[PDB]
Design a protein around this ligand. Sequence first.
Ligand code: 8Q1
Ligand code: UQ1
Lengths: 115, 112, 208, 88, 386
Amino acid sequence: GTSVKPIFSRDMNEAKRRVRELYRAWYREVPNTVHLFQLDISVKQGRDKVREMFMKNAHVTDPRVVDLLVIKGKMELEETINVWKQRTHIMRFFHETEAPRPTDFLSKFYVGHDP
Amino acid sequence: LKKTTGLVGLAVCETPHERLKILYTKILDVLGQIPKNAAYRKYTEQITNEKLGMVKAEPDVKKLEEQLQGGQIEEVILQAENELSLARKMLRWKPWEPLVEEPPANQWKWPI
Amino acid sequence: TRPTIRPRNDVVHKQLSAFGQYVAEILPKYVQQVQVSCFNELEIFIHPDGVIPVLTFLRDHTNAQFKSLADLTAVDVPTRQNRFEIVYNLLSLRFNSRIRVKTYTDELTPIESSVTVYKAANWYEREIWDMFGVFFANHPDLRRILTDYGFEGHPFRKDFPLSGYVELRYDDEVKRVVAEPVELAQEFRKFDLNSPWEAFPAYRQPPE
Amino acid sequence: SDAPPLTLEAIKDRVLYVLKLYDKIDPEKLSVNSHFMKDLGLDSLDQVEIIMAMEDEFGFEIPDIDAEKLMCPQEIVDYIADKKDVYE
Amino acid sequence: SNLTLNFGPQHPAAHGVLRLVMELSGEMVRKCDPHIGLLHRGTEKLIEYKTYLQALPYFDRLDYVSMMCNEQAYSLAVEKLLNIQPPPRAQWIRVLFGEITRLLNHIMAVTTHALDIGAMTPFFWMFEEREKMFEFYERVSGARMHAAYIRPGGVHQDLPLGLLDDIYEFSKNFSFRIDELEEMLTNNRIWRNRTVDIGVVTAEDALNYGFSGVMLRGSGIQWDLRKTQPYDVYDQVEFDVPIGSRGDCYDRYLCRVEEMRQSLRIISQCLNKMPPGEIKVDDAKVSPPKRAEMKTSMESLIHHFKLYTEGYQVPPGATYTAIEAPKGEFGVYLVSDGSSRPYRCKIKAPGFAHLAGLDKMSKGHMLADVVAIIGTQDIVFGEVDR
Ligand SMILES: CCCCCCCCCCCC(=O)SCCNC(=O)CCNC(=O)[C@H](O)C(C)(C)COP(=O)(O)O
Ligand SMILES: COC1=C(OC)C(=O)C(CC=C(C)C)=C(C)C1=O
């Protein structure tokens, strides 16, 4: 049994339903974010970025972890809708000033010691 | 007779002896539904009975405030209402049942 | 023994012990332990499920009347299966006393919000959520309070690094403030200070 | 007068037009019976996006349930017909 | 919809770094949402990375209007965990400088409150007195505000030979400055119009919202930590606790002025009753030895070395220690694991709970009323954000 208590969801089905509701809300919100913050990206770029964030935590199989992730996503959406975030906060998702780092062994061997 | 109890939001109560009697009777009625061996019932019944007895034995408000040692009889009425609400909540909670879920082996060990 | 040593008060110690026994007797369902420190501070260790009842009792009981919540914070002890220790400090103005209530939780277990008992809890729980990641159920409005917008992690956890993972600067190409991985010109220097000789024999632990 | 009486054929045409406006579906492989999960190779989030596009086009909201089980154009057409009480 | 406005952080009336998001209907305030953390520096984790002596200067910068009071609270907590006792002269010095610090804080609060409401002159009149008290601070410690003077052994150094005379000279004249400020503000009909019946809070709501200090006393609650739970020598001085009856801004302003007068009274008593003796505990495993002994005797040099490199160990245990700071109850929850570095140090700031109650206090008021209510809560964001 392992005797654990829930946050919101009983199993993975309800957790997936909450995930889908959060995704719908973010997808609806993206064009308003592009308009209000005067972003130079397109709506497609924003929705692709939204999709990318969800995919990152796709592997998780625990309903409590999924519930907490949905709570955090709702908090982030609330920050975005009320314009508590600024333009810099929204653009931090895109890492525009970070130089790309190669994943190949040779590139890493050449630059430094880090694995 | 008295005005301006001195605490913002606490109005002056007229006829406080009757109000205290009603509140203590209601508290006793609510406590009557708790099991006899429960500690909350007997402790609260004891203290409420002392307060009711000293209420029924003093018609002067200033001396009653001095005897109750409860700080300005309007606050005594407020505390009686709070106790009645707590008694209802405890009847709902039933916290006299045995302990549930003893803690892990070293949950409360300090240092480390 | 006289001039440099703090004097102890035994009347307050006896009174606090008696009240701890009183509270433990009234609420056997939730009270796991009661302690009185030797500088006369009373603590009550409870099961998490009794956060709301116990507090309510302490707030509304005629003999307790702890109507002020002085502080509410968390402590992180990674070696415990339940990582986080939740601490309530309560003050009774009627009896001029203080009491401490303690419980525990882990990363995935919610604790019931105590805003219905004390209004002051509203921000404190938010801080606990921001700094430690402990979720409070039925909180009217739970979100970050201290950290920057979009900040990731809970900095008051023991495994969170002191300087964090990201740092901010102004970039002229994008004409805005940007975040990057932390790089320090001088690394913070860790000091190993503990003496290899035991200081306090009264706290020695059994050799297992 | 108000809008003309909507028929099943118009609903089917609008649904198919929306579906081929989705950049992740090839127009020629799409049919009224094609399955999003199997024939078209779309995941759950693509289905959510399709349902949102249908919501936008037909001007009414479909809950999470009653939409989580629409897996091909025919089911969407039937659901719209049932909600709009259209028989022709 | 209501109009949404950013009040601060770059605002004269924001008292530093505060993002008040207000929802307004016209100039009526429908909702206040304080956003803080613009001065969150992560003090508690940093303290976790220091020895007990190294962490003391952080308390100077928590509430940078009342420095020695925070030093006193932290020192009292460490003393309780150490089971040691400061010497009497150190305690008398602590109470004297705590009352001087209360004078400084109350001057700042009242004058900047009046400045926000629209009276600029009393600020200028009273900041000269603030500068003289800064001179007292510097003569005792070498720094004008961040003294680091009060330490868990007592005080760092003894008074210079002429300090008490100058403190007496300042104290015998400060009451006339208080009188001039009162003549400017107390009976002015514009001041009363801007303060009376503004931000009323009931006693029960004040208790349940976690208020402390004047924010209780203005509503009639008869509470004061110096009278009910005295700490150093506060049981040996005589003073009165001012109590309000309306629970509004005006009553709290009157309470703060009267508290300044009572502070002058206590300072007089402390000046007359200063005893002789040492100024830190005569225990070299806690308090560092004198320089002459450190350069003469082996044990003194060893203890100096160890106290300045590793620091003293504190027996394991947790305490909650509170004082009546000028802004309300100031507390420390300090946990020791037995080593020379604290395991956990939670700081309780009265401004935290006071600002958390801003939305309740602003119901049915206007923008300028909210500015006055911000001033009446006596908020410094160094302690609110920590
Ligand atoms: C402008 C930029 C703004 C950026 C905002 C970023 C907001 C991020 C919020 C992220 C919230 C979460 O992590 S929510 C956590 C998401 N991951 C899970 O729930 C675990 C189970 N994974 C799955 O089911 C599939 O991989 C899945 C792909 C989900 C689809 O599922 P189906 O199809 O089988 O239905
Ligand atoms: C009278 O001129 C002055 C101001 O303008 C009203 C200020 O705001 C300030 C800053 C202090 C307030 C609280 C913003 C100072 C110091 C000042 O001298």
